[PDB]
Design a binder for this molecule. Structure first.
Ligand SMILES: [Cl-]
Ligand SMILES: [Cl-]
Length: 80
């Protein structure tokens, strides 16, 4: 678990955002409804509640949040 680039191929194990709030399972639909999931983007690594980049976001790995008022947010992934 290290990152390189926008973290596109990142198949790491981090499950909390940069502010230490824990990620929402990408399969789950609360508190937020994900626009990306394992059923639609099977090649994207949407397993558990880990930090991915299904959309080649320039800011790197993010995940759906568990704080009902925070939709998504980035992950502090060690630099590779
Ligand atoms: Cl939502
Ligand atoms: Cl999105």
């Amino acid at each position: 678990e290290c990152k390189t680039g926008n973290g596109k191929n990142y198949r790491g194990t981090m499950s909390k955002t940069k502010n230490g709030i824990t990620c929402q399972k990408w399969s789950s639909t609360s508190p937020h409804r994900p626009r990306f999931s394992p059923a639609t983007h099977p090649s994207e690594g949407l397993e558990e509640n880990y930090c991915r980049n299904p959309d080649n976001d320039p800011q790197g790995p993010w995940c759906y949040t568990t704080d009902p008022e925070k939709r998504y947010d980035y992950c502090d992934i060690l630099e590779c």
